[PDB]
Design a protein around this ligand. Structure first.
Ligand SMILES: [Mg+2]
Ligand SMILES: [Mg+2]
Ligand SMILES: [Mg+2]
Ligand SMILES: [Mg+2]
Ligand SMILES: [Mg+2]
Ligand SMILES: [Mg+2]
Ligand SMILES: [Mg+2]
Ligand SMILES: [Mg+2]
Ligand SMILES: [Mg+2]
Ligand SMILES: [Mg+2]
Ligand SMILES: [Mg+2]
Ligand SMILES: [Mg+2]
Ligand SMILES: [Mg+2]
Ligand SMILES: [Mg+2]
Ligand SMILES: [Mg+2]
Ligand SMILES: [Mg+2]
Ligand SMILES: [Mg+2]
Ligand SMILES: [Mg+2]
Ligand SMILES: [Mg+2]
Ligand SMILES: [Mg+2]
Ligand SMILES: [Mg+2]
Ligand SMILES: [Mg+2]
Ligand SMILES: [Mg+2]
Ligand SMILES: [Mg+2]
Ligand SMILES: [Mg+2]
Ligand SMILES: [Mg+2]
Ligand SMILES: [Mg+2]
Ligand SMILES: [Mg+2]
Ligand SMILES: [Mg+2]
Ligand SMILES: [Mg+2]
Ligand SMILES: [Mg+2]
Ligand SMILES: [Mg+2]
Ligand SMILES: [Mg+2]
Ligand SMILES: [Mg+2]
Ligand SMILES: [Mg+2]
Ligand SMILES: [Mg+2]
Ligand SMILES: [Mg+2]
Ligand SMILES: [Mg+2]
Ligand SMILES: [Mg+2]
Ligand SMILES: [Mg+2]
Ligand SMILES: [Mg+2]
Ligand SMILES: [Mg+2]
Lengths: 84, 54, 96, 64
RNA sequence: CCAUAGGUUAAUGAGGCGAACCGGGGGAACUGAAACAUCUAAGUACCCCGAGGAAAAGAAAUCAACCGAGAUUCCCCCAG
RNA sequence: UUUUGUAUAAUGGGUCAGCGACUUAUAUUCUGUAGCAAGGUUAACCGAAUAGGGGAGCCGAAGGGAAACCGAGUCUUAACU
RNA sequence: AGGACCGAACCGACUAAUGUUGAAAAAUUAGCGGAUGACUUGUGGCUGGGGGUGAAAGGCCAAUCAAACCGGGAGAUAGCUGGUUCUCCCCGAAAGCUAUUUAGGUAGCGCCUCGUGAAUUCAUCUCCGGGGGUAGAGCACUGUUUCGGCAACAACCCGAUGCAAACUGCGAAUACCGGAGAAUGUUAUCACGGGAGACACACGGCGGGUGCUAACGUCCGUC
RNA sequence: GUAACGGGGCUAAACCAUGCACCGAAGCUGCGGCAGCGACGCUUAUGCGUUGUUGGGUAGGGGAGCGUUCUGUAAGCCUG
RNA sequence: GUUUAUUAAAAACACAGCACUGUGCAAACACGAAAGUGGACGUAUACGGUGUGACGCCUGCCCGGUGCCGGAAGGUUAAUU
RNA sequence: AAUUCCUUGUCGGGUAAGUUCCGACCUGCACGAAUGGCGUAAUGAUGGCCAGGCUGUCUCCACCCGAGACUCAGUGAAAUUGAACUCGCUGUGAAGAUGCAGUGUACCCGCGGCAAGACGGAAAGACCCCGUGAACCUUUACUAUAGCUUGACACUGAACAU
RNA sequence: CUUUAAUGUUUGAUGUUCUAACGUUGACCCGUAAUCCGGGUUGCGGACAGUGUCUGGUGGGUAGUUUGACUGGGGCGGUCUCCUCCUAAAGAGUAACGGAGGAGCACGAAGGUUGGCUAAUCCUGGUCGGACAUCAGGAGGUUAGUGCAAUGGCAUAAGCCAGCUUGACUGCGAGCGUGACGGCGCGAGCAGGUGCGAAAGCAGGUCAUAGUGAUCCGGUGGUUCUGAAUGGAAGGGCCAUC
């Protein structure tokens, strides 16, 4: 089954990483924020990190849901537009 | 893969109901024994001794 | 006729099993017309002009659809709430 | 006479309330379905757009 | 031995041409399947025999579906 | 003509005259146009033959489900969401 | 006597010149080999095409032979080459992606054109809200690297100096994303539907892999 | 075979700086005309005058037309 | 001696000789759907097929592989019942 | 060596000088015993090398005799050919220019003679690659099949021993 | 009746012999002043041979075909899927026979939850040391450990340990991401029943990203979906799976 020859010519055919869902959109339970793929809970994102960190979404519908763990775990709080 | 030595397929089964549920197992690793719960056609869980019973 | 790139493959993926209703087609009798070009003898078998079953068939079962009777010894074996409650200005019947 | 390609019939014959005959779905079924649970629900079929046109030719008179 | 085999004679008749359609015996490959063996082309091409003015088929061990139709043939539908 | 590109030393033609290549059949689908309208239309055939007659039948006014089946609902699911 | 010797006829063809739109679709001229033999020749006959014949070269089978000629299946097939006829007006490409026994072919998407719709959709600019780890820089980390201080001649730690696509404790321009706003452009925008063509692109600028910061080189990006 | 300003020829007819002037394209303007669309003036099936603007173009899409042979209109009309 | 008629006449083909092998005659083998015919009106000192190629001196070791020849006890094994 | 790559091997011979030739050696890239080994008189339009003779093969061509070539009278082809008002040089350029640019040069038109460009003519490259081409050909490619073989049942029966 | 022996048998085997199908390219007689053929007699062979159907061999004797592509010509070599990083111009994405490696798994736990716990390394001490072994304190700061590449991530740890378990659940899914498409991925929330926790709550397999094969033809189980006169059945569908 020899397809061994280094050559070092070999792809990855990469996907999903992208920072789509930039800034505070109008809302929608859209993804917006994915990076590393997996992802779990999130809710109305607030952009978090540590040290510096803490993006500030501010705008979404009622449950963004996205960001795995490489970018501000979970989120959501009381922020919507006027209140939540 | 389909080496008669390593991982195989576990047909699995339940106690009266004629369900299925499938998964993988081994051979050399302790076997000839199995049973979990899993949910059948409907109702409660229980039994599901699958193949290789204690 | 050089349909280079046969439509089949690449379009031809996944093909669910299936069979066929041996029912000829069991036309519904019709658009809630029974009685009136229906021979006005209300029952139903075949010799009709405006709404016809077309004859070759096993059973009927009418839906309710267009405009109904004013008279109607509805038979046709058949059914539906659309039927029992719209054709009901007259002649129930169902038989077998 | 135009001969419908009897194959595609068995394949995606349909015609919702507006053509766009709903093909079908399912993948690995009846071969390798010893894998994945959630991502495998037969649900129902669906059609296409970029591809519909090709799958269009069969049928003519409503048959089944 | 018979009797046949064979022989002679005689009267009838055949024999050969023939365009196509028609019945029948034998029967491709290119081609297509975007390759190729199943499969297709096609029982087509072709070759052989036979007969008619037409040939062939034809008065159910047919079909139907619990109602019934009623030999064969040809035409439109059923249906791509 | 073919090409990224040809005065090209890449292809074709000595010249003239005549001929020389998207047709045809049936089927299906769009567009325009005409007829009629929830109805439209006949086929073979008959024929005082382009009439008139013939509505066998084809399409549309219902759809959903693999189907039985139900039906402006219906599948899905034990579910009435 | 002799598949004996020399040599005409006869049979054959080793060499050179000429011819090469010839006198000639293989010959002429001068030489040359055999010449009682597996010889040479007249007449007629027999072997038929996947078949014949063959002292064997795939040679010969009527100027035709790795399968004759004639007629037919036949308008075989040709993703290839060529060619394609009158006139005016409007719009106007692509030479990409993804598959492909696919790579000079196709097919879906993209881009052209024609129709019907639809919202102050589109686009430039002003401001607002965003994420970034590029250029640049730096050397805490990964790893290179010096030079100076503590190792029966050197890692390890301190100070001073560099280097990096697969280093980053920093970080632009900027492109992209969404929100308002004025103005401007014969909805430029999107959707669905008819017809497409089109997937060989070449050069120049900028950012780069390669190659030698070689090539009218080659492969991406962008204008 | 000058062939490393295109040639001539140049001490400035080179270069550097500064400023004015002139040549220079199918670019723009002027004048006339053609066609599409939006408007304007009206008129008002409609249409025409003014105006703004659009009119390079292979594959290819769309839209208009000319001409030829034959049929109807045709023992009608044209012609020794 | 023969050969590429029409670019090769040779070291190539043939040859006499040698060897292996097959054939008991309705021969093996070949032409042929068959009948039939050739082999041969011959019959092992004969006929076929293969290789070597006068003559001289010779022609060594390998039977593992493939092929062929013999055995066929035992294993495996078709139709058939 | 009809076999040796290194290779013009090394030594000897022939030569004024010999990558060939002849005689050796053996280090046989990669001879070898009937897909015969080593010899062999004779024969050979057979391959290689040397010599004598002979000479225009040559140094180096000269003259001459004839058939053309040239001129006149008669008859009268050919391939090729987009159109020509068809010069050189350097540069340009789809990259080797009569045709573009600059420049040089050149009164108009024949005849004999030569071939250096017209990438000259001829033949839709014979090499190379490509086509999901073609043909023959090979085999332990595949799938079939004639032929040769196997056995069962038929055509096909009678008894007997085990 | 059976375990078993003899005779009758029926029938399968080998082997014996016979004539009578069958052969005779032996002789003789007619047709016939024929070498054919046919009949007859005779001989030799004989249920053999041989033929037809079926069947195992063998089968380049012949026939039809296949024998890939990418490629700085082609060929040799290498590669044809998937995962990670750089190229990749700080949103995606983008090439080269460009520079480096990994997958074609593993796991009744290596999953779930609950409760709890935190490296590596060095210094000083310590018996069995003389580099590192368990102990003690100190410096103890991703320089540890992540089941396997690389990137990203990880202390609320996903890293480590134990108790209890089977959520590696069934039916759906707002709305999204990504694809020409087939398809692929994310997913709060809902319904039925679960496990762990006092409880808020967590769980729809593993820290995430590779560990994969469409269709057809079928196999197995389930279901009154269908079942060609009807009742069944075969077969077909549907669901689960190979
Ligand atoms: Mg009717
Ligand atoms: Mg084919
Ligand atoms: Mg070119
Ligand atoms: Mg030219
Ligand atoms: Mg002409
Ligand atoms: Mg002689
Ligand atoms: Mg010559
Ligand atoms: Mg002579
Ligand atoms: Mg002589
Ligand atoms: Mg003769
Ligand atoms: Mg000839
Ligand atoms: Mg044909
Ligand atoms: Mg042709
Ligand atoms: Mg393929
Ligand atoms: Mg930098
Ligand atoms: Mg292409
Ligand atoms: Mg391309
Ligand atoms: Mg390009
Ligand atoms: Mg280039
Ligand atoms: Mg001026
Ligand atoms: Mg001007
Ligand atoms: Mg134009
Ligand atoms: Mg001789
Ligand atoms: Mg010759
Ligand atoms: Mg010769
Ligand atoms: Mg020999
Ligand atoms: Mg020698
Ligand atoms: Mg020997
Ligand atoms: Mg010899
Ligand atoms: Mg002359
Ligand atoms: Mg010149
Ligand atoms: Mg030049
Ligand atoms: Mg000359
Ligand atoms: Mg030439
Ligand atoms: Mg050519
Ligand atoms: Mg062959
Ligand atoms: Mg073929
Ligand atoms: Mg290739
Ligand atoms: Mg990026
Ligand atoms: Mg960018
Ligand atoms: Mg210690
Ligand atoms: Mg993991």
């Amino acid at each position: 089954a020899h397809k061994k020859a280094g050559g070092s010519t070999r792809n990855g055919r990469d996907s999903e990483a992208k920072r789509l869902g930039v800034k505070r959109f109008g809302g929608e339970s859209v993804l917006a924020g994915s990076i590393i793929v997996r992802q779990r809970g999130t809710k109305f994102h607030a952009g978090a990190n540590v040290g510096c960190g803490r993006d500030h979404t501010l705008f979404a519908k009622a449950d963004g849901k996205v960001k795995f763990e490489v970018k501000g775990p979970k989120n959501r709080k009381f922020i919507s537009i006027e209140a939540e | 893969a389909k080496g008669i030595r390593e991982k195989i397929k576990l047909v699995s089964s339940a106690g009266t109901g004629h369900f299925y549920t499938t998964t993988k197992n081994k051979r050399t690793k302790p076997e000839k024994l199995e049973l979990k719960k899993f949910d059948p056609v409907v109702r409660q869980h229980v039994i599901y001794k699958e193949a290789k019973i204690k | 006729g050089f349909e280079g790139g046969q439509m089949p493959l690449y379009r031809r993926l996944p093909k669910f099993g299936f069979t066929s209703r041996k029912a000829a087609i069991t036309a519904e009798i019709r658009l809630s017309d029974l009685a009136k070009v229906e021979g006005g003898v209300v029952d139903l078998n075949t010799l009709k002009a405006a709404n016809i079953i077309g004859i070759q068939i096993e059973f009927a079962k009418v839906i309710l659809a267009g405009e109904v009777t004013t008279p109607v010894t509805v038979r046709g074996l058949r059914v539906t709430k659309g039927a029992r409650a719209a054709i009901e200005a007259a002649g129930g019947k169902i038989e077998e | 006479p135009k001969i419908k390609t009897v194959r595609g019939a068995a394949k995606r014959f349909k015609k919702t309330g507006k053509g766009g005959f709903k093909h079908k779905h399912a993948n690995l079924r009846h071969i390798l379905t010893k894998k994945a649970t959630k991502r495998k629900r037969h649900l129902r079929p669906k059609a296409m757009v970029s591809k519909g046109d090709l799958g269009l030719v069969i049928a003519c008179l409503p048959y089944a």
